[PDB]
Every structure is written in structure tokens, then in C-alpha cells.
PDB file of C-alpha atoms and ligand atoms in Angstrom:
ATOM      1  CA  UNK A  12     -22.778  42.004  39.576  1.00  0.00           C
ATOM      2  CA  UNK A  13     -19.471  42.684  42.667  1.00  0.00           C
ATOM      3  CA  UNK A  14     -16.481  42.335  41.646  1.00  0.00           C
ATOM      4  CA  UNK A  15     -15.989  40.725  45.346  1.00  0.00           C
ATOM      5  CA  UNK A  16     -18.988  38.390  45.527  1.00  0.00           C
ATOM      6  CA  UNK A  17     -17.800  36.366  48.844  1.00  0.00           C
ATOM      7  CA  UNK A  18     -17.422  38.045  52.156  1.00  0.00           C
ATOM      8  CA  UNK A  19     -15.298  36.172  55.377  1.00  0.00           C
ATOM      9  CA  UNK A  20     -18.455  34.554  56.880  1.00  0.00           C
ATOM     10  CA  UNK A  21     -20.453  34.015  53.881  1.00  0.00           C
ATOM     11  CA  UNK A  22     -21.941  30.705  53.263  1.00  0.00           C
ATOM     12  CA  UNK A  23     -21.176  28.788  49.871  1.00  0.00           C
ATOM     13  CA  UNK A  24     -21.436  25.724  48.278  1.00  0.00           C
ATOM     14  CA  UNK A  25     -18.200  24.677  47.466  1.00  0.00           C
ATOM     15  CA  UNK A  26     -17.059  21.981  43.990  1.00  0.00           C
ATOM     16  CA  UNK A  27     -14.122  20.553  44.967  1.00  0.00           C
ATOM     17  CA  UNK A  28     -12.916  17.498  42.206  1.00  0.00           C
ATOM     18  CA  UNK A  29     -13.738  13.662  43.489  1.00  0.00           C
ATOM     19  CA  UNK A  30     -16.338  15.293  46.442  1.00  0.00           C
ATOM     20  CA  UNK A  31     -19.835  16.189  45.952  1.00  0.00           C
ATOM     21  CA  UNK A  32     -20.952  20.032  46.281  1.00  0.00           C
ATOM     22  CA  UNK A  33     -20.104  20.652  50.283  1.00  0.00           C
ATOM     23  CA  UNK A  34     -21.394  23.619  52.428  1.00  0.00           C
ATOM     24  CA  UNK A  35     -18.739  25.825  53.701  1.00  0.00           C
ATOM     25  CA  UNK A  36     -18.220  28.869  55.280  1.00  0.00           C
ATOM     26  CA  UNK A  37     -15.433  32.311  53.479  1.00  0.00           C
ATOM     27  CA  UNK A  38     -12.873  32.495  55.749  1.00  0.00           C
ATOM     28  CA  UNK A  39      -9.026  33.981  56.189  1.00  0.00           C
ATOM     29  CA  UNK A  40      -6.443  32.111  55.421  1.00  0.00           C
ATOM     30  CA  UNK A  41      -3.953  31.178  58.478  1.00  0.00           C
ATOM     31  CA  UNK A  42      -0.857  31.832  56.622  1.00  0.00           C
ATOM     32  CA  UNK A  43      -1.752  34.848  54.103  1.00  0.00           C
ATOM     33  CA  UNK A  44      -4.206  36.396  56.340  1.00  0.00           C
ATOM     34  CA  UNK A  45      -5.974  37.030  53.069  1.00  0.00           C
ATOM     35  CA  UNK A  46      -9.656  35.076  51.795  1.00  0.00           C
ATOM     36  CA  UNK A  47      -9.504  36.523  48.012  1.00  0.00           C
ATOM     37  CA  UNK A  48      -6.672  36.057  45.356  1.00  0.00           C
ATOM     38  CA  UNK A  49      -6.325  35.964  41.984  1.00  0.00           C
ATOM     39  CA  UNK A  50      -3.951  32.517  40.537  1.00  0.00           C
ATOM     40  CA  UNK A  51      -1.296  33.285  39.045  1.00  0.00           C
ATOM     41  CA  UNK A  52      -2.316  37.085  39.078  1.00  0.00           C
ATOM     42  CA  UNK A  53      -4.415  36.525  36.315  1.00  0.00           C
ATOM     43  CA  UNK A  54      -7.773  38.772  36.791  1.00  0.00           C
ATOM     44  CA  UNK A  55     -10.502  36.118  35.529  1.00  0.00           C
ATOM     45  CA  UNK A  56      -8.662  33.719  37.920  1.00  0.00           C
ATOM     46  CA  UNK A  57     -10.406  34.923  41.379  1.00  0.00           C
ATOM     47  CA  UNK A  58     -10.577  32.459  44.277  1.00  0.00           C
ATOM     48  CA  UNK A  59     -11.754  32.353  47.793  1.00  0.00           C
ATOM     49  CA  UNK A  60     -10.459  30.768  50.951  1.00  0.00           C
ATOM     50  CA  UNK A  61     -13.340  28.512  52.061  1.00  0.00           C
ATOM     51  CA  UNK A  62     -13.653  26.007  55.749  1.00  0.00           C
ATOM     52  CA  UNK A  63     -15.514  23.128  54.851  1.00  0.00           C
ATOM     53  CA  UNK A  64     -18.615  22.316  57.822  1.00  0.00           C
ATOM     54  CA  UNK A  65     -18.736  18.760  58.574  1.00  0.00           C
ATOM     55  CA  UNK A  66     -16.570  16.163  60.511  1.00  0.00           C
ATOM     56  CA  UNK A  67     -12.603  17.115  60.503  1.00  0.00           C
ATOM     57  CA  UNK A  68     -11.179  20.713  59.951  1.00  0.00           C
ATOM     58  CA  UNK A  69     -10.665  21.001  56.245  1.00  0.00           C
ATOM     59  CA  UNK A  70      -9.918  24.185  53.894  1.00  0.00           C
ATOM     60  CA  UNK A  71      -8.773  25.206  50.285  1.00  0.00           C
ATOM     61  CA  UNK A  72      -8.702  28.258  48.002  1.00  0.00           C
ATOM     62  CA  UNK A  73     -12.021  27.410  45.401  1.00  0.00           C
ATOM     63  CA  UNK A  74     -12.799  29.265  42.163  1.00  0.00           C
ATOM     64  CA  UNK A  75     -15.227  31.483  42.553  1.00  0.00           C
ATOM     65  CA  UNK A  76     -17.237  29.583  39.583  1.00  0.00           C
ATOM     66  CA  UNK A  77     -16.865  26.289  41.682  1.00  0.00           C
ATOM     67  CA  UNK A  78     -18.573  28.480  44.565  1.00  0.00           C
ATOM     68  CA  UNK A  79     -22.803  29.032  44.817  1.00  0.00           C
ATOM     69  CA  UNK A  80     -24.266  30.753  47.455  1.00  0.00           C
ATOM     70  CA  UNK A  81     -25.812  28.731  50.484  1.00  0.00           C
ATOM     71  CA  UNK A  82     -29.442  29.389  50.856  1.00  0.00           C
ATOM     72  CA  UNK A  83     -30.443  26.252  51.754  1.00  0.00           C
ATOM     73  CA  UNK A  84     -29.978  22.124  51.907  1.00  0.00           C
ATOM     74  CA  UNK A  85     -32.734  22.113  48.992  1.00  0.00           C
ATOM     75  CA  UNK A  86     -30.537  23.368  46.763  1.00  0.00           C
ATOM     76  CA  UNK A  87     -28.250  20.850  46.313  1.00  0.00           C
ATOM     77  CA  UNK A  88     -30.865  18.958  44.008  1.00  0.00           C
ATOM     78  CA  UNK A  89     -30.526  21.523  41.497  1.00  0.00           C
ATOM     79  CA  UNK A  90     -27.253  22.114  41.859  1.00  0.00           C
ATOM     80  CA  UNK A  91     -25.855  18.988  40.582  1.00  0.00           C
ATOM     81  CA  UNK A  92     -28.074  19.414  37.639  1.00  0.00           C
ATOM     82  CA  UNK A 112     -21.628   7.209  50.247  1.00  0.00           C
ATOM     83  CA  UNK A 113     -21.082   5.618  53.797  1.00  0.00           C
ATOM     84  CA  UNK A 114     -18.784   7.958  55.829  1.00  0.00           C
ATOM     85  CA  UNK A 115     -19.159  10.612  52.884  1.00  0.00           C
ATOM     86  CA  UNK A 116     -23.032  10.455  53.261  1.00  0.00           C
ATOM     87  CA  UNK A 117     -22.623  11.148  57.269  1.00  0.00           C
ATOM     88  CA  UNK A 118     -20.051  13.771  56.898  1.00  0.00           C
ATOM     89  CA  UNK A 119     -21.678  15.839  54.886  1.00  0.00           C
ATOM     90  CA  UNK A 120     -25.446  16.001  56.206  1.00  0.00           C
ATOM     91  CA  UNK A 121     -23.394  16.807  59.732  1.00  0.00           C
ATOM     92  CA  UNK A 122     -21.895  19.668  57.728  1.00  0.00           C
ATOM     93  CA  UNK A 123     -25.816  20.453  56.359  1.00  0.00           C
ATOM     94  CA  UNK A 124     -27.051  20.568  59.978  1.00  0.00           C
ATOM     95  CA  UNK A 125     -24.294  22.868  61.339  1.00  0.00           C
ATOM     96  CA  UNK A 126     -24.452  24.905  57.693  1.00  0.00           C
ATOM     97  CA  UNK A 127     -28.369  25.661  58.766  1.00  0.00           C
ATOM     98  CA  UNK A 128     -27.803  26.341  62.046  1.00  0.00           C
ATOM     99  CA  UNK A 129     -24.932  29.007  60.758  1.00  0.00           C
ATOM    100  CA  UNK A 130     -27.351  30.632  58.024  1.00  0.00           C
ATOM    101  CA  UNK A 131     -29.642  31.311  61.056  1.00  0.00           C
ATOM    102  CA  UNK A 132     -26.877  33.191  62.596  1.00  0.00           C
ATOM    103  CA  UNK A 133     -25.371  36.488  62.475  1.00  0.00           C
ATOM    104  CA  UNK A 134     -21.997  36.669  60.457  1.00  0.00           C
ATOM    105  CA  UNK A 135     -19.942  37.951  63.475  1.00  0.00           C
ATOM    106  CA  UNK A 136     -21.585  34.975  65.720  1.00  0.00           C
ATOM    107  CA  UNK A 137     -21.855  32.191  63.146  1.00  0.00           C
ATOM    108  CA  UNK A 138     -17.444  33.460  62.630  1.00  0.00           C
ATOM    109  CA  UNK A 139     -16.677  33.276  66.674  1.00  0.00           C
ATOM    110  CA  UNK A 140     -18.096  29.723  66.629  1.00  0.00           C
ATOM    111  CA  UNK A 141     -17.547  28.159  63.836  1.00  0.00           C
ATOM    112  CA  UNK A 142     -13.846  29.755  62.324  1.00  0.00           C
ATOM    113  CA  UNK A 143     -11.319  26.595  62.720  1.00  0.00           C
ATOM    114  CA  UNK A 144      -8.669  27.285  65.532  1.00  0.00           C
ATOM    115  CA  UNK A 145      -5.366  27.975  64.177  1.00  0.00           C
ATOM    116  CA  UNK A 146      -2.140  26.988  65.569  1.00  0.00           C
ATOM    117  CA  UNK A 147       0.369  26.984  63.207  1.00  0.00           C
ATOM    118  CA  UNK A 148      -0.273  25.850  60.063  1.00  0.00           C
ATOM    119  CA  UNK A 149      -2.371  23.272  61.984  1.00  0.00           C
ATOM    120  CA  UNK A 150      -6.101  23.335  61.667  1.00  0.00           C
ATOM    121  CA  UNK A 151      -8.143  22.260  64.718  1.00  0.00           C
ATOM    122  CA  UNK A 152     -11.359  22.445  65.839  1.00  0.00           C
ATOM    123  CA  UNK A 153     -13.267  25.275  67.402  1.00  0.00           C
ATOM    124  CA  UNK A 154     -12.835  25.586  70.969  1.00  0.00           C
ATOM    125  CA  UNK A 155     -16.600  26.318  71.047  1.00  0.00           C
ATOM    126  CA  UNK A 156     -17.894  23.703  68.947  1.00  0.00           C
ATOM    127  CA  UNK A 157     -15.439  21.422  70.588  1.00  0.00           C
ATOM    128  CA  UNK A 158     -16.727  22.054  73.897  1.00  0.00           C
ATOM    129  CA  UNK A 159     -20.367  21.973  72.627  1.00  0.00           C
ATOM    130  CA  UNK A 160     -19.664  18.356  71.345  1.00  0.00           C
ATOM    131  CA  UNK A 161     -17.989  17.325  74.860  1.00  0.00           C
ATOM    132  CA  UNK A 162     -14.788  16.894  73.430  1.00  0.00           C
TER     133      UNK A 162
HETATM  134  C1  LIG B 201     -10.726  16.250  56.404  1.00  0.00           C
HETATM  135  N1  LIG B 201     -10.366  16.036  55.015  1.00  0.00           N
HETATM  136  C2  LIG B 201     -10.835  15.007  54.320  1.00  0.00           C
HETATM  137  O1  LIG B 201     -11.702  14.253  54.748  1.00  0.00           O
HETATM  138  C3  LIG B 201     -10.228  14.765  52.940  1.00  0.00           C
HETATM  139  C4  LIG B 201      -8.969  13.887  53.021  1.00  0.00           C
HETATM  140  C5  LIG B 201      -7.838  14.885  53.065  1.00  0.00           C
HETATM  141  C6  LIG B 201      -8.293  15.981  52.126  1.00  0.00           C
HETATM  142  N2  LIG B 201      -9.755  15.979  52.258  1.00  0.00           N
HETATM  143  C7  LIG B 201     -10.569  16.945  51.699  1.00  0.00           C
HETATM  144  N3  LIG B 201     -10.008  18.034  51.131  1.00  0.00           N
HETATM  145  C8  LIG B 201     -10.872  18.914  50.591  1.00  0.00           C
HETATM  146  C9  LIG B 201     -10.277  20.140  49.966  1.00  0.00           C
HETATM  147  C10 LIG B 201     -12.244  18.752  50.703  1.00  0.00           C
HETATM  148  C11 LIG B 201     -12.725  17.617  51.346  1.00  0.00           C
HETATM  149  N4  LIG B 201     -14.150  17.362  51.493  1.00  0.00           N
HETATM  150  C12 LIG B 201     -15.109  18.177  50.753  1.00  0.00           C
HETATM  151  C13 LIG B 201     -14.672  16.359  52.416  1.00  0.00           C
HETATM  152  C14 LIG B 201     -14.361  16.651  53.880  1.00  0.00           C
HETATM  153  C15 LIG B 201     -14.853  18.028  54.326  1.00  0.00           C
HETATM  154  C16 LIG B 201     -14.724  18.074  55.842  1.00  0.00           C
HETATM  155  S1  LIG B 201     -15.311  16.514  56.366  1.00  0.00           S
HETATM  156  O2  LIG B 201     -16.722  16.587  56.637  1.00  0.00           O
HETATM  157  O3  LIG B 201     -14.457  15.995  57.398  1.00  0.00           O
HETATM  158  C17 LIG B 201     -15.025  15.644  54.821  1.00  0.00           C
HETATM  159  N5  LIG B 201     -11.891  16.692  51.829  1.00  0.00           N
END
């Protein structure tokens, strides 16, 4: 056992209530800067700033007990133990694996959602890899 288990870049499975277990990547958050806290200062309380892979830019600050490490896709049998859902999330599988792959400063430059504001867009890279 860390203290700090998640690093910015890190891959995790993130539990988020009404959605099934998502890959994401650790990342800063645009406001704070920071991607570790502890709610409401209390030290069992840790959380991590997560980006969620898939369709639209999404983020949130997770409990580190609703986070898992991302090996792989076949994990998500065991870890639980939907139309537009369903696509959504194996696009945010195939861009997940092709991150893992990847080293962390690489798989940060491409995949980290662009910031502007408090607005959350997507990566000028990925973007332009999609044709957009
Ligand atoms: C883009 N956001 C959304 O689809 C919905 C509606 C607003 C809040 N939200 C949401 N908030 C959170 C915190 C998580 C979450 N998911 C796990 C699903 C999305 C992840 C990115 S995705 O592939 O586009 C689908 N979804």
C-alpha cells in the first residue's frame, strides 16, 4: 500500500451512480489545478480527478474506492461481480486500450480534454484525428 495510489495519466475504472464501471484516465482539474483531495478534509475521504474516454468530454472527482486500476477491457466481467450507453462506452474501451499501450506523457498530450474556461472540449489532437 501508497498513500497516493493514482498518478495524472493513470488509467482507472471509474463507479460513478446510475452508469456502469467506465474507463478513464487521472487528470488535473481545470479550476484547482489539483487531481487529489480529501472531502471535507476528512483523511479516509481521498478522491481523484478523473476524464472519462468515450463520446463527449466528461469529468468528476471519484472516491478512490469507486476507482480500480485499468489493465484491461476483460476486467470489467469481474468487476461488476444500453443503446447509446452501449456505443459510448466500448468507444471509450477502444481509445482506453490504445492509451494503456502508450506512454503516460504521450497517452496525456493526446488524450487530456482542452480547457477553456471552465469549458471542457475535445482534444485538438483527437479532434483532428476524427476529422472534426
Ligand atoms: C457527457 N456526459 C454525459 O453523457 C452525462 C450527462 C451529463 C453528465 N454525464 C455524465 N457525468 C458523469 C460524471 C459520468 C458520465 N458517464 C460515465 C457517461 C459519459 C462518459 C463520457 S461519454 O462517453 O460521452 C458518456 N456521464
Amino acid at each position: 500500500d501508497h498513500l497516493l495510489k493514482y498518478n495524472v495519466g493513470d488509467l482507472v475504472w471509474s463507479k460513478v451512480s446510475g452508469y456502469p464501471w467506465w474507463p478513464c484516465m487521472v487528470s488535473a482539474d481545470p479550476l484547482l489545478h489539483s487531481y487529489t483531495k480529501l472531502k471535507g478534509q476528512k483523511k479516509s475521504a481521498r478522491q481523484y480527478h478523473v476524464q472519462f474516454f468515450g463520446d463527449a468530454p466528461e469529468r468528476a472527482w471519484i472516491f478512490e474506492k469507486s476507482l480500480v486500476a485499468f489493465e484491461g477491457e476483460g476486467q470489467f466481467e469481474k468487476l461488476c461481480q444500453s443503446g447509446k450507453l452501449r456505443a459510448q462506452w466500448e468507444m471509450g474501451i477502444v481509445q482506453a486500450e490504445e492509451a494503456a499501450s502508450m506512454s503516460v506523457e504521450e497517452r496525456k498530450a493526446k488524450f487530456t480534454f482542452l480547457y477553456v474556461g471552465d469549458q471542457l472540449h475535445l482534444n485538438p489532437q483527437v479532434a483532428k484525428e476524427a476529422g472534426i
